[PDB]
């Protein structure tokens, strides 16, 4: 599945923000509008025992340009909340759950 890292519009948001995908599918994260962004998965907010560096970006880390992407396959099931670190208080978060 491929997500947008900020809207058509130059809204901050993910687009789509909340979907559900099956174990091993790859999620495609595309830098599209209002970047630098990225895709952090929260820590207390992700299936137990999954480790959250294996999934996420740093929170330092940042795609910087059109057409960067960033690419990630869950395969705990479970809901997972990630957001972009810039922009969280601006509401770019948004939730996969894996069934
Ligand atoms: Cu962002």
Redesign the pocket.
Known sequence: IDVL??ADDGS?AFVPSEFSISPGEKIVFKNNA?FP??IVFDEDSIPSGVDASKISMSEEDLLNAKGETFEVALSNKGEYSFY?S??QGAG?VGKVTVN
């Open positions: 890292l900020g901050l209002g962004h990225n972009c810039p922009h770019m």
